[PDB]
Amino acid sequence: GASVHKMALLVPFRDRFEELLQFVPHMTAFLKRQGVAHHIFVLNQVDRFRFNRASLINVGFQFASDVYDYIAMHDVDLLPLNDNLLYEYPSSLGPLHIAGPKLHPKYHYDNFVGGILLVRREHFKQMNGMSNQYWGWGLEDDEFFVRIRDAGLQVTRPQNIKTGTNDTFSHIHNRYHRKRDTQKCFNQKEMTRKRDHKTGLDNVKYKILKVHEMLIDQVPVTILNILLDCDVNKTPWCDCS
């Protein structure tokens, strides 16, 4: 009756249904080939504020059952094309970053931890998850990198991968079709550039309005409809309208 690690695949989501239909069969087959037990949670942001990838991931982490002993923060549009990218339980060193800057098609800087990042449950809890202050594109992953170093942890990446930035992942994301929300308002630039010791997993404010059970060509996926709250006295750049 051997125990096996189980991965909660946490997919930040808003208006990406076409991407989702490609994601689910691709990831299900890819993970089955390497024997990784897992479940996909689509973290569907249904408030009207700007997209907040990091807070959705905090909510996903809270919701997912304790049976999942590690999470994969996973963009819905970024699909691994190399079976040697192992989505395995991370070591004691810290998070396992699958979409490394030598492998990612777009981002190539040393401490990039975006795209696909696998974290043990206990490490994520020790770090108080991710900051809640990042509304709109950018920076939430870089702040989480500092959280990793501040916890005395390190990032590990796949070794001896022979593919490179052109052929390790498919990133089907056209910048005019899916526009990156890079607006700034109020003092967003100056506030989001600073390390956030005040927010995270323990104080993300939200309601899950509905949980949907979906099957896509027989593959079960959970949809969380997440209503994020924004405190405009703290982060008014949740809405630049």
Ligand SMILES: O=c1ccn([C@@H]2O[C@H](COP(=O)(O)OP(=O)(O)O)[C@@H](O)[C@H]2O)c(=O)[nH]1
């Ligand atoms: O309006 C949005 C913005 C982003 N995302 C999710 O957030 C991920 C990261 O965003 P993006 O693709 O814009 O980042 P980049 O391609 O710059 O890494 C996407 O793949 C989606 O999973 C989404 O679902 N809706």
Ligand SMILES: [Mn+2]
């Ligand atoms: Mn993308």
